[PDB]
RNA sequence: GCGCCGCUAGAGGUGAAAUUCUUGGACCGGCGCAAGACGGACCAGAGCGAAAGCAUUUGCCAAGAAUGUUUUCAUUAAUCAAGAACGAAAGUCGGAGGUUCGAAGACGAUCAGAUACCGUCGUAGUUCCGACCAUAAACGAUGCCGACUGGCGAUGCGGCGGC
């Protein structure tokens, strides 16, 4: 039974993409199979912001961002829970989940 | 004609010395006997003298190159590595 | 007096502070503005005695308590911050001893200047220690 | 080391924790201002409007 | 009795009207009718000889004076080169790296010719027969037919004798063993088939 | 047993006179112990100092290097060594679906101060653009890149270090490679990414004490 | 070594057809002294006192010299036939633009 | 890795733990250097290639798909026994080189037992050059060529026309 129309790997007209290495378990996967995630989390852990502004020498100091791209194997994507077991007629959709900032 | 299939230059030893010690000589021994192209007069007359020495048939200019060949694979790197230190830092 | 730099009270002096928050330990290495002269290198693995807890958030907390008590005693008053990660070939997420190190240093009497994430990043450099199928826990 | 013990009133409860229902988080305020608040976790019944005594005042917010 | 060739580089004599002749270890790439320069400000090309204090780090150096003014001693064999790392312009003590790999802190006034030695890669042909090993060591020494010491009498070797060909005594002896007993593995730190390459300083 | 921090002193490091703020900070160093004299025990200290603590108005995400060259007792003077951008800027302006172009060049000044210049730029999604893949072709990439290194060669090959280092506090080079490329393809976030120093010309003290004048 | 030596050698095969040209050493010496040579070309590998006197008579007759980036068995095929040749001179470019080019 | 200074006694690694590296001063921090691998973020259900595969810039070439064409020759064509070409990795032979990872191997843990997972050190191998081998889930698990048969929104390359 062919499970998926593209076979997990979103390639069409190639023979070989560059194999990249997983981020926590260091396992070798191709570049377009990997469960990508890009994290622009603040470095300050924003509970800890009005505890440093009393200690800050500056008054309007733009707290720096932190830029990490996590790229996963599919085995440590499920166990560390960035993706999830789904249903048949809700597999064929390429949309991300909703944002909801607060 | 075609006189062999798998010896070439080391057929002069014949049934002796083995088969991975005549496979080993046949890359060195065609290398030491060939006539290399002279980098000084264009021609191919570099007839190998005693070991290390190489010498042109014409223009008579004696280059001390490799032992079983003309250009050592390390010495090709070195001449293009000395001039790397000659322009970087200008010394 | 001889020890300490000589300044006024309305002004202050800057010395940067390497917060090395890797996994399985934590460093709160402080230095001066040159980058060279080490002031104090106390470590969360030295002020807890467990070896389960070398990178613990409680460990970097009271390591930061000691280094401010050393920093403010020597004379240096205000810090820049140069947080890192494991760096390069290995992982790039800074560990649990990042914000447990900096807020503890902030609450315990210190001025703070420019903070910065200056961890190493390669260009597809080397080959990583797990094997091809990875470490299989 | 030597930090005085800080007393704290809770605002809105965040619910049970610890996986057995034995602990709770209060998001206390420090009884000094209307601002400087930490989200901590206690065990026992809360009844919004109390005063509870934090033996230190800088730990954490829960995130896994 | 040598594999590396020799150049003979004639120099003009700055003290009397003459021309005098040297014999250098031929650093590889040179040819007849080439100007080889020599001194403290000789420009860093191949075949030139100049003290190691002025050349940059990491260059490739053969035929050096181990002690200044010696006139050429270290790394002279065919296809060899010492590598200078880490100058230190105060105390005038730099270091190099010999072809054995034991890096050596030397003086910084050591005049030392630039390049790799010609005639290299010579140990990659088999001698392949006893005649070319006869002819190899008929022109060097009298050392080529080496008889195993197990294969002679007890009056002539510490290993020989016995109704088989065995050794009996362990082949590793101490360094102050008397002359005539130092046969076999002289003061061996380890023995047996070497796994690895060297893995110790 | 002995404290090894009371055997130290505290100089102060001064920026060049090509800026506004001069008090960088107070580095520290051990005193003279016999053979070890501490004058050249700090000549060569690189200072990771930004611009808003070395200008007043200029941006915070750009920093200079400033090796130390000589010591005038307590005041200890420096000289421009290099620059780079902070990392939080350099990978915030890296987005998806826009092609980064980059160019590098070894251009020396008229002062014996051989420089290495690094620049980056990111193509510009227009106002009324509806499509998302705002990429440039390969021949547009090469000829913008030739245009980029043409401009910084006009700015550095022509005259010496001081007018060059004065040129990039307002970053006139990055604005000028902005304007002269947008006829090929428009660009928007176009910076000189990093400057690396390659040579050092014989170390006078006259050129030091002119850069530490007014 | 990638794109644009379609100036110097592809012009030279055009003068292999059209214009008049002499080869070698003692022919390109006999055309440079009596004026008829217009642009001598030295190979990389001609010996140096041969290189430095075809340069010298070109200084006397006030003509041009174009040193070539290549061996005489690399200039020789760049002319277009099989012998090796060190020094050549063109005495008329037919409809190329050698003299109007970079030198 | 190696210099040169700075400081201090642990660093390391794990679910824990140790084998290990450590005051003949390591880890950390700074200036330097050298070697050899490698081309991140930009990198996408984008492009090229017959396939294998292909990513730092600039530099001889040699080639190619397609579009545009009121160009020329006019069946020159499609598939193709025998027959050849290129063919990932691993492998074998010869020479350079040996940073990192690392079959085998050693040792520590875990276990009833671990010759396995985890840990540390690490050989052959990786890396380049010249010769061989001709296999893979060499997978769109679909031989190539030709026509016809629905729609819509796009992305890539040209060409034409447009506020
Ligand atoms: Mg024998
Ligand atoms: Zn994983
Ligand atoms: Zn010749």
From Swiss-Prot, chain C:
Family statement: Belongs to the universal ribosomal protein uS11 family.
PANTHER family xrefs: 40S RIBOSOMAL PROTEIN S14/30S RIBOSOMAL PROTEIN S11 (PTHR11759)
Location of region: Disordered: 117-137
Name recorded for this polypeptide: Small ribosomal subunit protein uS11
Gene encoding the protein: RPS14
Modified residues (Phosphothreonine): 119
Pfam families attached to this UniProt entry: Ribosomal_S11 (PF00411)
Physiological role: Component of the small ribosomal subunit. The ribosome is a large ribonucleoprotein complex responsible for the synthesis of proteins in the cell. Part of the small subunit (SSU) processome, first precursor of the small eukaryotic ribosomal subunit. During the assembly of the SSU processome in the nucleolus, many ribosome biogenesis factors, an RNA chaperone and ribosomal proteins associate with the nascent pre-rRNA and work in concert to generate RNA folding, modifications, rearrangements and cleavage as well as targeted degradation of pre-ribosomal RNA by the RNA exosome.
Crosslink (Glycyl lysine isopeptide (Lys-Gly) (interchain with G-Cter in SUMO2)) position: 47, 49, 92
InterPro entries: Ribosomal_uS11, Ribosomal_uS11_CS, Ribosomal_uS11_sf
Keyword line: Cytoplasm, Isopeptide bond, Nucleus, Phosphoprotein, Ribonucleoprotein, Ribosomal protein, Ubl conjugation
Signal sequence segment: none
Swiss-Prot record, chain E:
Cross-linked residues, Glycyl lysine isopeptide (Lys-Gly) (interchain with G-Cter in SUMO2): 97, 182, 198
UniProt modified residues of type (3S)-3-hydroxyhistidine: 164
Predominant cellular place of this UniProt entry's protein: cytoplasm
Subcellular location: Cytoplasm
GO biological process: cytoplasmic translation; translation
Residue ranges, annotated region (Disordered): 155-180
Keywords of this entry: Cytoplasm, Hydroxylation, Isopeptide bond, Ribonucleoprotein, Ribosomal protein, RNA-binding, rRNA-binding, Ubl conjugation
Entry's Gene Ontology molecular function annotations: RNA binding; rRNA binding; structural constituent of ribosome
GO terms under cellular component: cytoplasm; cytosol; cytosolic large ribosomal subunit; cytosolic ribosome; focal adhesion; membrane; nucleoplasm; postsynapse
Additional record remark: This protein can be partially incorporated into E.coli polysomes in vivo, indicating it can replace the endogenous protein.
Subunit structure: Component of the large ribosomal subunit. Interacts with CRY1.
Name of the protein described by the UniProt record: Large ribosomal subunit protein uL2
Residues of the whole record sequence present: 53 to 253 of 257
UniProtKB/Swiss-Prot annotation, chain F:
Transmembrane segments: none
Description of post-translational modifications: ADP-ribosylated at Tyr-135 by PARP1 in presence of HPF1.
Alphabetical keyword list: Acetylation, ADP-ribosylation, Cytoplasm, Differentiation, Isopeptide bond, Nucleus, Phosphoprotein, Ribonucleoprotein, Ribosomal protein, Ubl conjugation
UniProt key word Ubl conjugation: yes
GO biological process, any: translational initiation
Major subcellular location class: cytoplasm
Locations listed in the record: Cytoplasm; Nucleus; Nucleus, Nucleolus
Domain of life: Eukaryota
GO cellular component, one term: cytoplasm
Single GO MF descriptor: mRNA 5'-UTR binding
ADP-ribosyltyrosine modification, residue list: 135
KW Transcription regulation (keyword) present: no
Result of altering residue 135 to F: Decreased ADP-ribosylation
Record location of the Glycyl lysine isopeptide (Lys-Gly) (interchain with G-Cter in SUMO2) cross-link: 14
Residues bearing PTM N6-acetyllysine: 14, 36
Known function: Component of the small ribosomal subunit. The ribosome is a large ribonucleoprotein complex responsible for the synthesis of proteins in the cell. Part of the small subunit (SSU) processome, first precursor of the small eukaryotic ribosomal subunit. During the assembly of the SSU processome in the nucleolus, many ribosome biogenesis factors, an RNA chaperone and ribosomal proteins associate with the nascent pre-rRNA and work in concert to generate RNA folding, modifications, rearrangements and cleavage as well as targeted degradation of pre-ribosomal RNA by the RNA exosome.
Family: Belongs to the eukaryotic ribosomal protein eS1 family.
Protein name in the entry: Small ribosomal subunit protein eS1
Source organism of the structure: Homo sapiens
Included stretch of the parent chain: 21 to 234 of 264
UniProtKB/Swiss-Prot annotation, chain G:
Classification via Pfam families: Ribosomal_L7Ae
Xref: PROSITE patterns: RIBOSOMAL_L30E_1 (PS00709), RIBOSOMAL_L30E_2 (PS00993)
PTM sites of type N6-acetyllysine: 20
Cellular compartments annotated: Cytoplasm
UniProt modified residues of type Phosphoserine: 4, 10
Residue(s) of cross-link: Glycyl lysine isopeptide (Lys-Gly) (interchain with G-Cter in SUMO2): 20
Domain of life of the native organism: Eukaryota
GO CC terms in record: cytoplasm; cytosol; cytosolic large ribosomal subunit; cytosolic ribosome; extracellular exosome; focal adhesion; membrane; nucleus
GO terms of molecular function: RNA binding; structural constituent of ribosome
The protein's role, per its UniProt record: Component of the large ribosomal subunit. The ribosome is a large ribonucleoprotein complex responsible for the synthesis of proteins in the cell.
Quaternary context: Component of the large ribosomal subunit.
Similarity remark: Belongs to the eukaryotic ribosomal protein eL30 family.
PANTHER family: RIBOSOMAL PROTEIN L30 (PTHR11449)
Protein name: Large ribosomal subunit protein eL30
Originating organism: Homo sapiens
Gene name linked to the record: RPL30
């Amino acid at each position: 039974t062919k499970k998926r129309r593209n076979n997990g790997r979103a390639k069409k007209g190639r023979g070989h993409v560059q194999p990249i290495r997983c981020t926590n378990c260091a396992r070798c996967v191709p570049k377009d199979k990997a469960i990508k995630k890009f994290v622009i989390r603040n470095i300050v852990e924003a509970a800890a912001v009005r505890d440093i502004s009393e200690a800050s020498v500056f008054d309007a100091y733009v707290l720096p961002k932190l830029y990490v791209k996590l790229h996963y194997c599919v085995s440590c994507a499920i166990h560390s829970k960035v993706v999830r077991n789904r249903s048949r007629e809700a597999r064929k959709d390429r949309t991300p989940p909703p944002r909801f900032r607060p | 004609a075609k006189r062999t299939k798998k010896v070439g230059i080391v057929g002069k030893y014949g049934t002796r010395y083995g088969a991975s010690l005549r496979k080993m000589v046949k890359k060195i021994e065609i290398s030491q006997h060939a006539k290399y192209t002279c980098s000084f007069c264009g021609k191919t007359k570099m007839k190998r003298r005693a070991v290390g020495i190489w010498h042109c048939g014409s223009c008579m200019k004696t280059v001390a190159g490799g032992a079983w060949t003309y250009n050592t694979t390390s010495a090709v790197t070195v001449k293009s590595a000395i001039r790397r230190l000659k322009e970087l830092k200008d010394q | 007096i001889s020890l300490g730099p000589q300044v006024a009270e309305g002004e202050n002096v800057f010395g940067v502070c390497h917060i090395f928050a890797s996994f399985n330990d934590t460093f709160v290495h402080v230095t001066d503005l040159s980058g060279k002269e080490t002031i104090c290198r106390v470590t969360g693995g030295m002020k807890v005695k467990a070896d389960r807890d070398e990178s613990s958030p409680y460990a970097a907390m009271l390591a930061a308590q000691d280094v401010a008590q050393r920093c403010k005693e020597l004379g240096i008053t205000a810090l820049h911050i140069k947080l890192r990660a494991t760096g390069g070939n290995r992982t790039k997420t800074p560990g649990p001893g990042a914000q447990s190190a900096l807020r503890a240093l902030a609450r315990s009497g210190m001025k703070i200047g420019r903070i910065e994430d200056v961890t190493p990043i390669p260009s597809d450099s080397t080959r990583r220690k797990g094997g091809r199928r990875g470490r299989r826990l | 080391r030597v930090q005085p013990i800080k007393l704290a009133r809770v605002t809105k409860v965040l619910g049970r924790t610890g996986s057995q229902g034995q602990c709770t988080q209060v998001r206390v305020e420090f009884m000094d201002d209307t601002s400087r608040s930490i989200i901590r976790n206690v065990k026992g019944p809360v009844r919004e409007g109390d005063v509870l005594t934090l033996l230190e005042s800088e730990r954490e917010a829960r995130r896994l | 009795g040598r594999g590396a060739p020799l150049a003979k580089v004639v120099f003009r004599d700055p003290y009397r009207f003459k021309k005098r002749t040297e014999l250098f270890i031929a650093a590889e790439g040179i040819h007849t009718g080439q100007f080889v320069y020599c001194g403290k400000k000789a420009q860093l090309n191949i075949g030139n000889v100049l003290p190691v204090g002025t050349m940059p780090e990491g260059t490739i150096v053969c035929c050096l004076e181990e002690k200044p003014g010696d006139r050429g001693k270290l790394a002279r064999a065919s296809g060899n080169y010492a590598t200078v790392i880490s100058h230190n312009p105060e105390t005038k003590k730099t270091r190099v790296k010999l072809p054995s790999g034991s890096k050596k802190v030397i003086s910084s006034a050591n005049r030392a010719v630039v390049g790799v030695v010609a005639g290299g890669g010579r140990i990659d042909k088999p001698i392949l027969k006893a005649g070319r090993a006869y002819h190899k060591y008929k022109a060097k020494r009298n050392c080529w037919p080496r008889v195993r010491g197990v294969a002679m009498n007890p009056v002539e070797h510490p290993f020989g004798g016995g109704n088989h060909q065995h050794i009996g005594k362990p082949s590793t002896i101490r360094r102050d063993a008397p002359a005539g007993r130092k046969v076999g593995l002289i003061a061996a730190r380890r023995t047996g088939r070497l796994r690895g390459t060297k893995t110790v300083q | 047993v002995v404290d090894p921090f009371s055997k130290k002193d505290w100089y102060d490091v001064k920026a060049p006179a090509m800026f506004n703020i001069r008090n960088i900070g107070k580095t520290l160093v051990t005193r003279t112990q016999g053979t070890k004299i501490a004058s050249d025990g700090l000549k060569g200290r690189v200072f990771e100092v930004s611009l808003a603590d070395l200008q007043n108005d200029e941006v915070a995400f750009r920093k200079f290097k400033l090796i130390t060259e000589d010591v005038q007792g307590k005041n200890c003077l420096t000289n421009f060594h290099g620059m780079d951008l902070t990392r939080d800027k350099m990978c915030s302006m890296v987005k998806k679906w826009q092609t980064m172009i980059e160019a590098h060049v070894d251009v020396k000044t008229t002062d014996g101060y051989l420089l290495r210049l690094f620049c980056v730029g990111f193509t510009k999604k227009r106002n009324n653009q509806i499509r998302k893949t705002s990429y440039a072709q390969h021949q547009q990439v090469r000829q913008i890149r030739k245009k980029m290194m043409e401009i910084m060669t006009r700015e550095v090959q022509t005259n010496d270090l001081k007018e060059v280092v004065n040129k990039l506090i307002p970053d006139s080079i990055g604005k000028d490679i902005e304007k002269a490329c947008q006829s090929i393809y428009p660009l928007h976030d176009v910076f000189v990414r990093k400057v690396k120093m390659l040579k050092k010309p014989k170390f006078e003290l006259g050129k030091l004490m002119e850069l530490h004048g007014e | 070594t990638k794109k644009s030596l379609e100036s110097i050698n592809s012009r030279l095969q055009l003068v292999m057809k059209s214009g008049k040209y002499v080869l070698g050493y003692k022919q390109t010496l006999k055309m440079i002294r009596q004026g008829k040579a217009k642009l001598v070309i030295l190979a990389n590998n001609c010996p140096a006192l041969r290189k430095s006197e075809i340069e010298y008579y070109a200084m006397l007759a006030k003509t041009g010299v174009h040193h070539y980036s290549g061996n005489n068995i690399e200039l020789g095929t760049a002319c277009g036939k099989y012998y090796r040749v060190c020094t050549l001179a063109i005495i008329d470019p037919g409809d190329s633009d050698i003299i109007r080019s970079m030198p």
